């Protein structure tokens, strides 16, 4: 019951753009951070575990990194199917706790 503070709340970008989501752990959580995506009405999907490992089958445009208490997700060239909400999670102790989310939307105009 470490809090994960996720920046930003939302962002707008386009197909092809590079994007960076951030989570700050309120305490040291070591490398025990996972990143989930979720599309509306659907269940989360694991993307990254142990702060920087790709889960099977997830697109290589995704990567995680850590620096201290800070965990970052980059998507290097946004594809259509990447416009969804992203959550970080720490699972170092009980309760596992989640960042509040980042909806990644497309700039329309």
């Amino acid at each position: 019951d470490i809090q994960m503070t996720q920046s930003p709340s939302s962002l707008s970008a386009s197909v092809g753009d590079r994007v960076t989501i951030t989570c700050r752990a309120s305490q040291d959580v070591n490398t025990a951070v996972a990143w989930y995506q979720q599309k509306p009405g659907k269940a989360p999907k694991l993307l990254i575990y142990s702060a920087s490992f790709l889960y099977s089958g997830v697109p290589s445009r995704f990567s995680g990194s850590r620096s201290g208490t800070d965990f970052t997700l980059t998507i290097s060239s946004l594809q259509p199917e990447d416009f969804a909400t992203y959550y970080c999670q720490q699972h170092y102790t009980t309760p596992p706790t989640f960042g509040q989310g980042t909806k990644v939307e497309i700039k329309r105009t």
Binding site: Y36, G41, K42, A43, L46, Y87, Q89, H91, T94, F98
Partner: protein, 120 residues
């Protein structure tokens, strides 16, 4: 065929009760930890309880402690969430998931979601 299937949600009035189901398929419940994670309508994901089905170990979030019970039928390969004394605040889509295995404590598989509505 590693999948979790949930069941049991509906409309229920305040101070009512509900038993949700997470039936495992492809692996076995006894081996892993099973989590229930909810998500209120506007909101993000919130962990509620956890159980290790071999030894019977459970942990609960403060919100739920004393109101809910998570249990496991290992023969049936199903976990359960018994939610009694339902407040309007517990309206959410409930998700069970698992920890993959050893040294892999990321929730790698999740069920579809079952919605529990609580109002008059």
């Amino acid at each position: 065929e590693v999948q979790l299937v949930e069941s049991g949600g509906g409309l229920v009035q305040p101070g009512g009760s509900l038993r949700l189901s997470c039936a495992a398929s492809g692996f076995n419940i006894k081996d892993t930890y099973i989590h229930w994670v909810r998500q209120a309508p506007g909101k993000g994901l919130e962990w509620v309880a956890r159980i290790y089905p071999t030894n019977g170990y459970t942990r609960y979030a403060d919100s739920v402690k004393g109101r809910f019970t998570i249990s496991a039928d290992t023969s049936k390969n199903t976990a359960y969430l018994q939610m009694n004394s339902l407040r309007a605040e517990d309206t959410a889509v409930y998700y069970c998931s698992r920890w993959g295995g050893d040294g892999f404590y990321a929730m790698d598989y999740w069920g579809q979601g079952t919605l529990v509505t609580v109002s008059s």
